[PDB]
Design a binder for this molecule. Structure first.
Ligand SMILES: CC(C)=CCC/C(C)=C/CC/C(C)=C/CSP(=O)(O)OP(=O)(O)O
Ligand SMILES: CC(C)=CCC/C(C)=C/CC/C(C)=C/CSP(=O)(O)OP(=O)(O)O
Ligand SMILES: [Mg+2]
Ligand SMILES: [Mg+2]
Ligand SMILES: [Mg+2]
Ligand SMILES: [Mg+2]
Ligand SMILES: [Mg+2]
Ligand SMILES: [Mg+2]
Lengths: 304, 307
């Protein structure tokens, strides 16, 4: 059993609002008409609960509804035709990007555009102008990464390990989720601290772990759809090796990346007591996400 | 004197655009038209000759925007560093609300000042040469530059001095170097994919190049910044933290500069192979960072600003 190797030298936590938030995410998905096929156990609110465990219910609900939105958007890209049609996806992302800027939805817009607009409207009530910009960009880059994956599928091109790993950092909107840690913990990190190279390298490390963990768990389902945007499948193509060896290599990178994150957590320079207090809350927020992603995915029927 | 020149060397060469002089004369004409020129050596500014060195392969239309942009930063910085607005957070937030609005595409009004009109002209001209995604990335780096200037204003107003770690982290934005680095894409006419543009090794090369440029400037600009009682300078910050002599601080400042050049060269060889086309485009961008490192050094020793 190779899944037992997805381990960390730290533990996670879950919000006491977990179930109340998850049932509210289902009501939210139903309201904006995101529920279509079949849908008893999605439990997208139970991932948010683990990801932002100290968050007040109102903020955790936005995060939960946001995580839900991403899963609905991802399933469309990876298991339907739009993920092989760039023209359709460009037309869709033009509407999303307009909604991110604060444009009101119109009669011709789809359910996902309406849903994103509500999340943007709600984030606007709880986040300052400077935060929305940083969120917009990370989400804008998330769309760009999906258009890139769409082109690869449409042109039948598989990227090398170097290219995939670089693109995979944006293709999961992990940086956009890490932004919500600021609102969840209610911290105002100053520009110099927020964008410091060590914080970036901690974010990059945390992002890789989360994504490479998911790649090990979701390779079977992505393989059946012929979607090779997966560390295991990209490694297999590059090294022309067996699937067990490809999994073994992916887990070696995961293990090495956990070590890097732990090593680099101690390399944060001292700015002042107040700023460093806020940073450890954010860096704790990263660790919560690392665990939240692994804890949920092993129990979730999605990778069964 | 020679001790400085031997420690401000780089293992790579710079270059200058053949359009240098007409671009500089046009920048002086542009500045005068928008009323950015103060009554006082107006021909001995040469803001165009920095741009020419910074973006040497750029077409004349593109280089001119960059030259007018560099001129704009210089006029703006002199306000924050050598006038009363840099000791008043209230007036600066009011001004910075107008700039950020102009960057979002807002038309200037009657009550707006010269710099607001000048920035609106640059955004309009950049909108004709750069796509939507580029303008966003430029706006952010310029927005963070404004925030960094507001943070210095607070430090001056309270009479507080940051430690080496705080200054070095904040100095990366106070220069608007990332905003200047964005123009390399338009200058070299390259389309770097998201994954290559925002890659960690590329980010490390940028902040390495940013540190070299800013720490080089600090070594040459501590005399005139000391006169205004401003300790936003690696030399003066190291002196404050260590409580050492001014020669010792300069030595420590040039040590960091020297090791950062060594880092940049080491990081340059660590860029992974994506594909022929992307690596070629990225090769042109990283060369652009080397041109900027030399441009800042070559110009500042040449210029009258630091004398
Ligand atoms: C899915 C998504 C964009 C957001 C919600 C899921 C979250 C927040 C999990 C963290 C790891 C990420 C971002 C991978 C999902 S993309 P994938 O195509 O690998 O997803 P899959 O393996 O099908 O679950
Ligand atoms: C004016 C400006 C922000 C940019 C022009 C110079 C450029 C583009 C080079 C990169 C390093 C910078 C910007 C430092 C000057 S800020 P400072 O207050 O230290 O300025 P000074 O040293 O007095 O020239
Ligand atoms: Mg996907
Ligand atoms: Mg998927
Ligand atoms: Mg997956
Ligand atoms: Mg300054
Ligand atoms: Mg100055
Ligand atoms: Mg200086």
């Amino acid at each position: 059993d190779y899944r037992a190797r997805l381990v960390y030298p730290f533990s996670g936590a879950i919000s006491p609002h977990a179930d109340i938030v998850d049932q509210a995410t289902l009501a939210w998905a139903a309201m904006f008409g995101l529920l279509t096929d079949s849908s008893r156990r999605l439990q997208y609110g139970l991932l948010a609960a683990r990801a932002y465990p100290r968050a007040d219910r109102e903020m955790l609900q936005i995060a939960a509804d946001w995580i839900a939105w991403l899963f609905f958007m991802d399933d469309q890209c990876d298991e339907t035709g739009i993920g092989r049609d760039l023209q359709r996806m460009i037309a869709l992302h033009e509407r999303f990007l307009a909604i991110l800027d604060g444009a009101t939805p119109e009669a011709h817009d789809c359910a996902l555009t309406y849903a994103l607009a509500d999340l943007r409207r709600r984030l606007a009530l709880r986040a300052p102008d400077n935060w929305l910009r940083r969120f917009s960009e990370h989400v804008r880059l998330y769309f760009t990464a999906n258009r890139w994956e769409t082109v690869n599928r449409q042109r039948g091109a598989t990227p090398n390990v170097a290219t995939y790993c670089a693109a995979r950092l944006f293709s999961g909107a992990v940086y956009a989720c890490f932004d919500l840690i600021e609102l969840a913990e209610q911290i105002e990190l100053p520009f110099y601290a927020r964008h410091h190279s060590i914080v970036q390298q901690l974010e990059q490390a945390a992002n890789n772990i989360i994504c490479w963990c998911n790649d090990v768990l979701s390779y079977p389902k992505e393989m059946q759809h012929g979607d090779r945007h997966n560390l295991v499948l990209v490694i297999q193509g590059e090294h022309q090796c067996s699937l067990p060896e490809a999994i073994d290599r992916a887990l070696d990178l995961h293990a090495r990346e956990v070590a890097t994150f732990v090593r680099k957590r101690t390399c944060v320079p001292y700015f002042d007591a107040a700023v460093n207090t806020a940073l450890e809350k954010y860096v704790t927020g990263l660790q919560f996400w690392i665990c939240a992603n692994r804890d949920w995915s092993l129990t979730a029927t999605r990778y069964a």
